[PDB]
Structure 1
């Protein structure tokens, strides 16, 4: 028994709720929150900008030091950094950005990073401003992640479509 309240059960290990991931993190303070990162950890908009604003830019400050030492991530890759005021840890995961010409097949590799953590609060990778279809992202998530994932979907109409079309 963990602290996630109001999630609807989709599979043995995947749960879904209509809420902003940033607001879910502030309330729950999970062990791991997943950020929809880019390879530069430049958190300007979307999930990344939203979570970073909630950290008063401390996420960006930590991220810039990480990149200065280690260089960019790979598309499909991840790193673990502080969760600041939102979580114990933030798992920054880079899904392909199809609006930028990146390969959608890399979405499975991105979700595989979740398997290194027993429980995660997460958004739909590669969706939103990354350009992939949310329905597809949920399918890859369910078919790739084996650990316990709590998906927070901000958009009510998208949430309803994801639940109603789920196979």
Structure 2
């Protein structure tokens, strides 16, 4: 039993809810919240900009030190950093950005990072300002992640479309 509330169950291990991931994180304080990161951990907009704003920019300060030490992530890769006031840990995962021409096949590699964590609160990778089809992202999630994932979808219209079209 865990504290996630109000989710629709899609499969054995994948759950989905129309929710603001920032507000969901503040309430649940999950072990892991996933950020929709870029390789530079520049959290300017989308999910990343919103999570960083909720940490009062502490996420960005920590991220800048990480990059100065380690260099950029790979598209499809991840790193574990602090969850600040939102979660124990933040898993920063880089899905491909279609608006940069990145190979959508890398989306499966991106979701594989979730399998290193037993339970996660996450957005749909490569959705939103990353330019991929969220229906496709949900399909890759279900077909790749084997650990327990609680997906937060900000847009109610998109949420209803994702549920109604789910196979």
Quick check: TM above 0.5? yes
Normalization by structure 2: what TM-score?
1.00
Kindly state the Cα deviation for residue 14 of structure 1 after the two structures are TM-superposed: 0.1
CA distance in 2, matches of 1:131, 1:103: 12
Q: Which runs of 4+ in 1 moved over 6 A?
A: none
Kindly state the Cα deviation for residue 96 of structure 1 after the two structures are TM-superposed: 0.2
SS in 2 for 1:35: strand
Encode CA deviations 1:33-71: one digit per residue, 9 max, x unaligned.
Answer: 000000000000000000000000000000000000000
Encode CA deviations 1:89-111: one digit per residue, 9 max, x unaligned.
Answer: 00000000010110000000000
Instruction: Work out the number of aligned pairs and report it.
Output: 167
Encode CA deviations 1:78-132: one digit per residue, 9 max, x unaligned.
Answer: 0000000000000000000010110000000000000000000000000100000
Normalization by structure 1: what TM-score?
1.00
CA distance in 2, matches of 1:94, 1:2: 27
Structure 2 unaligned blocks of 5 or more: none
What is the Cα-based RMSD across aligned positions, in Å? 0.3
Kindly state the Cα deviation for residue 140 of structure 1 after the two structures are TM-superposed: 0.1
